[PDB]
Design a binder for this molecule. Structure first.
Ligand code: AGS
Ligand code: AGS
Ligand code: AGS
Ligand code: AGS
Ligand code: AGS
Ligand code: AGS
Ligand code: MG
Ligand code: MG
Ligand code: MG
Ligand code: MG
Ligand code: MG
Ligand code: MG
Lengths: 300, 300, 300, 300, 300, 300
């Protein structure tokens, strides 16, 4: 087997990456894309050494693989420790879609999320925001984008509290149950949310302003053809199946002023104007805002 | 020796599974039948290796078997990881039977669940939905079909919340008390439910629309001969014992318009009509809908 | 010597048992008596193996016994898995005794439960139902008969919920507080209940019909001599102790039509008549019904 | 060395005792004295074996000693299981002292409890019932006698329910919070209650008769001398000291009819007569009743 | 053989630290800056030893490094023991910023915390206070400044209890979950807090006075231009963002009397007056107070 | 071999200690000072053994050190068993201080605690009692004096329960998390408590008298000059500092009647008179009382 040459190559890779990491850890952690790439490369080298050890029974290969796993673990631990000491995080981009039941919010949100995660980085991931009745985050791995379906189904005050905690630039600790997950932090870039409620928070809620100002895009949706069909021919499934289109052109979307809390233009401070929009335009605006915030956080 | 022959066979099988996983993973997880076959093959190879190891004590044999077990576990973990990060799931098929007490709903539900599980896949398995007194999902193993009896017995609103959560195409994390089951999800293909309440949810409930649209087949059951005999010959066990047939002829079934909530054909949006049905026709329709949805999920 | 032949016999027993299990696991689990007998034989084998291992001291016997107990545990685990995969259980036989205070319902119920447990299976056990202030089932082990000493004392509607849950053929999950007890279900064959209330449920309760149909035998008890003795000469302990009898002749028993809720013969659907009865006749009838149900559940 | 010979001796005793447990499980679990002595000897043997193990240095003797320890552990577990499988328990002897404040019934109750505990078994323990504030029983240790001070106090419905639960011959399970405390029985033999209430339960309580029948000795206590001293010489400490006596002769006690609930001799069924008594007659009668019940249960 | 020479130098440094520690543990404990520098040097040396051990593979270097780290751990444990027995600590300096939402409290607080952490020590760190949903302090590493964002968002009274416990000179033990972190204490020097509430505690609170006196600098903030722009042009993101400045000139700050609880000058024991302040005046005053307290504690 | 001679001398000293303890178990277990001195001597022997092991590690020397540490462990286990088997242990002296907020109670309490610990024994330690947020005692080391601050801040009921449990003369077992700590006894001579609430318990507490009787010294504090200044100059911090003297002469201390619950002299048994006191006078009286209590416990 060509074990010696691959071992030498991975040795060179790990040593050069070790020195590179040791150089400027502070700027590296403030550079999100570079750090993510470095972690991915470390994982690739680790799994490659693991499989190389697995397929060979030579004790020398096993010892070398153990040494390389030791080195890679040390580097990953040092970088993770530097990242935990940070005192700020980027402010995530939050999109919240409100509309009647059965019109297509969930599948549109899935499309938006995948497009965004691809745009931020090739190989980006989508994660799940645990909902009420689950109080820990042990399924979380720090993905680029997060999905939150049925926000406000029941217990909307707790939904507001979670949203205020995570939609911010101040660091945050997350409750976990497993021993090795204690002391985890929320470091995702974007959040997409679907709800049936009339807004982010109730109009009599104490923290109305704090939660409303944290939503970057607040979209209100309808679908006239779906609703008309369901109204005139109840129980007919083929017609309704015909009312939906593969480019989401059945959804009619309006956008509210940044910081609003209903579909009439009211914000906690003044009155603005609603404006029509589509799903491509929303994707373009969201991508632009994400890149802008990323650049300004790098320059911070 | 036959032992080394079986060892070579299982080595070839694990090599085939490894190369299949390495080639493509997203297309494999998007193909539910192929992924399940993959899992079955890996489980059978693991069990055969374990029993063969137990039947002997040769150091070389145990070493080879432990290495093979490690490789099998690695492949299984990789597939599990790929499935955990899916952004969508197939929408389950949900049947809810309402009717007066004592007439035979639970038996019909078990018949339907067995046949459905076998038709979806040879060796289907049916599982249990925890009821309102149990708040954790330990004891769920990703079953093809799930059975849920006494829906709305005391706490119909928590049952409504649970049903809305699980019946969807949005991935979901379940609450479990063991550490090793932490952050697991719901991946079932159908749910069969029996009820004594007038419908899926109260007419004054807030999430009436969201809950009703998620019910695929709403069946209303009666049994006139049984009710007559237990009315005119109370306390007589034998006359009542004689009113049940081994093919469910005693049950008389009506089907409501998809999205309704009562006997008279009312829906949240319109006013449709009822339709007489039988248990076998209902089964054929459920199989047809399950196949349609599975093909669409594989394509999308 | 004795150890060699004993371990050879144990090996033969375990191998033939493994063959039988592999052959007809499903038949066994559907055949209650055979499954119970095989489980008891496995318990005997494990106990004998551990005793023999402890008695002697040398590597050969200890290693052989360890392997044997491991294989026995694997067989028991596979059988338990198959038993947990079932879609149905046998409907338990339920007896409820209602009468005025201080006449001897508890002693009679213990007599009945002991006789029933002995008849269902030589060496059967009797367990306890967590009454009302304990919400967990961590003492439950899967006994033949269950004893419910007070029912409806302080919260009768919660008692009705629990009785509806456990008196069924649908598989059930039990709430437990220990880690190793998570995902436990109810498999007992008979339930004897003593009460101080008018009937199984309040007359205006909402689930009267569901809970009253599930009581096989509803007995109303009295003791005219005891009541006369304590009404004419209050405070006399000697006369009271004189009143009772070792053969339970002091109790007079009436039987209501099945599905009734009071002692006037009323049922939720009709109106029957009351019958006289005794403890021995009750025991004979209950054994007959239990064997009938066991045979019919097995023959499927 | 000598460690051989001694081992033989001690181990023989172990197995010897095992024999008298194997053939007499019913008797040992029936009578508390024999089982208590058996446990005492078993733990003495375990301590002796630990001492020998720490003293000894031969691998063979420590192997034998740990084998003996395992044998002791399994025997103790068997005894515990047989005890936990009981379908009945001995009925407690319950004394209730009804009297106004500032007469000295708490010290009298402690004296009675101590003498009873010594009589029932030498060097017995005395425990405290949870004080209507903790709903769990974590401190409980199965004491011979239980003392309940200030029964009632505006929370007498819950106290009535608790007394009905514990004063019985049916097995009971207690609510706890610790993992190892789950599923705990009740095993005490006598209860002494002191209260200011006018009886065991309110005259309108639903469970009046059931609660009244379980009280063995209901004694109404009065101290005319102390109340006279308070009337004549308020704030006089020397007179306060003078009124009390070391022999409790200052307490005037009326014994109520068996099963009564009032100081006028009223009973839920008839009318009786109050009698005069004292501390020593009460203690003698309690001891006699306890011995009667204990032997009756032992032979059954 | 430079590795041996550097290892000998490290050993000499370890011996120097060992002899230094024995000088006076009590005074070194009293001197916080010296203790922090000593621990920093110790951990840096140990990390260097471990890294150079990882670089090499010969037994000699690893053995020498194990001995050196054993000495290092001995010293670290001795100093930890000395530091754990103290009966007093120093009072942290507490800054609390109160103002309307969205004006820049969190970013100003981050600025202040960074500057103050560097001012206290060259290279000091900032850490995160656990919030109401997280229950354990496993992310705490004894950092020199602490951040607390969103104080009193949901449960203000629990926040008051926590702040009263941590702002004090009495030693405090912190709840945690990992075993090795059982029994660690709070040792930070400064705390920076932001809130939307109108003061440290609600006026009707039982512990108003105890909590108010523990806050050293209470600042009330307002940004009139930001409020004007967001009121006149609701939804104009660029116009609003043009109002924020890199020198925090947009935010106007008034300092309240030591011990006050609102912005009208009121104190629990009287009424004072408000004064104007800025970022740099706050920073200089906080540094002066911190240095004063550190010196006074040193002398004590 | 000087190492062998030193090890033999240490072993002979250990054996002498064992024989002295065995022949004088009662005195060692009773006299607190004797037990502390014995523990310190054993700790010194352990330190010498560890130093000897560092000096040499020959296999014979290793075995000798193993035997020495085994002897020391035997001594520790014997002492622990004797103390656990002890019927009772000396009860501590409680000094509770109450007063307005921010007058200097914590610093005075620390001063008094240090002085007491030094008086009772040279090099006497001081410990911190866990507060409400912590429920485990893993940081307890059997200190001479315990210090408790902010008693009754949030959990006055649970604080009262802990005060009743802790001052009792019966043996008490402490909760702990780590496996070794499990089985931890409480042994300490004095408890100094600083409070903001009036009196040890509220006037309506059912166990008011029982918890008051556990308090030996009850001090009420007032600092009239500090209060007047902070009333007249709310914001002047230097003026506030001017009022505190390094001899604690700014405090005014009153002492309440034995058993009292408030500062007006009222007692459960009547009423009394307050007295002036000072910190040194209180210290001398407390030392006298603790010495008398220890003497009477030892003499028996
Ligand atoms: N783009 C689409 N292509 C095909 N079918 C669609 C599409 N969008 C919606 N549907 C159909 O409409 C159903 C509604 O799906 P969802 O997107 O979950 O609706 P919804 O708006 O989330 O409803 P709520 O508010 O959660 S009750 C789907 O299950 C499909 O049957
Ligand atoms: N197909 C059948 N064959 C034989 N007996 C039957 C059949 N269906 C019902 N029964 C009998 O009728 C009883 C009715 O029980 P279930 O089937 O559980 O009725 P149900 O509709 O679930 O009533 P509820 O709503 O749960 S009270 C059964 O327990 C059997 O004794
Ligand atoms: N078979 C019997 N032999 C001897 N004494 C008996 C017998 N049956 C009842 N007794 C006596 O009568 C009492 C009645 O006790 P229980 O059996 O508990 O009566 P009960 O019907 O359960 O009353 P409730 O409803 O539980 S308050 C017993 O405690 C005995 O003293
Ligand atoms: N025989 C006695 N010997 C010595 N002191 C006694 C005696 N009887 C009463 N006393 C005193 O009387 C006091 C009254 O206290 P308790 O005995 O608790 O009164 P009590 O009857 O319990 O009041 P209640 O009903 O619980 S409020 C005791 O604390 C003793 O000091
Ligand atoms: N100094 C600044 N430099 C640049 N942008 C700023 C600055 N201050 C505020 N902003 C912007 O305004 C937003 C206000 O954020 P925060 O500082 O978190 O406000 P806030 O005072 O904490 O509001 P609350 O109380 O948390 S609702 C920031 O997220 C930035 O987008
Ligand atoms: N002897 C002293 N010398 C110097 N400053 C003192 C002295 N006593 C008190 N002070 C100051 O006054 C403050 C009062 O704090 P504490 O000693 O904690 O008072 P306190 O009695 O504990 O108040 P509470 O009840 O905890 S709110 C201290 O933090 C010091 O700043
Ligand atoms: Mg949706
Ligand atoms: Mg049913
Ligand atoms: Mg009873
Ligand atoms: Mg009393
Ligand atoms: Mg903020
Ligand atoms: Mg204080």
């Amino acid at each position: 087997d060509q074990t010696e040459k691959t071992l030498k190559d991975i040795e060179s890779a790990v040593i050069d990456m070790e020195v590179l990491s040791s150089t400027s850890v502070t700027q590296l952690v403030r550079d999100k894309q570079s750090a993510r790439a470095y972690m991915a490369i470390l994982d690739n080298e680790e799994e490659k050494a693991r499989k190389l050890s697995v397929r060979n029974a030579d004790p020398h290969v096993v010892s070398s693989t153990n040494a390389l796993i030791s080195r890679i673990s040390m580097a990953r631990a040092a970088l993770a420790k530097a990242q935990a000491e940070m005192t700020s995080r980027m402010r995530p981009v939050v999109i919240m879609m409100c509309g009647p039941p059965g019109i297509g919010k969930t599948k549109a949100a899935e499309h938006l999320a995948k497009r965004l995660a691809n745009e931020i980085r090739p190989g980006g991931k989508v994660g799940l925001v645990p909902r009420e009745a689950v109080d820990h985050w042990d399924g979380y791995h720090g993905e680029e984008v997060m999905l939150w379906d049925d926000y406000g189904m029941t217990k909307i005050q707790e939904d507001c509290n979670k949203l205020q905690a995570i939609a911010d630039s101040a660091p945050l600790t997350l409750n976990c149950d497993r021993i090795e997950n204690k002391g985890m932090q929320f470091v995702s870039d974007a959040i997409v949310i679907t709800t049936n409620a009339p807004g982010p928070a109730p109009v009599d809620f104490v923290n109305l302003g704090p939660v409303c100002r944290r939503v970057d895009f607040l979209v209100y949706c309808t679908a006239p053809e779906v609703e008309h069909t369901r109204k005139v021919s109840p129980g007919d499934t083929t017609a309704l199946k015909d009312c939906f289109k593969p480019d989401f052109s059945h959804l009619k979307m309006e956008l509210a002023p940044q910081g609003g809390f209903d579909n009439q233009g009211n914000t906690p401070f003044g009155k603005g104007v609603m404006k029509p929009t589509t799903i491509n335009r929303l994707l373009i605006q969201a991508v632009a805002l994400t890149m802008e915030r990323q650049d300004e956080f790098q320059l911070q």
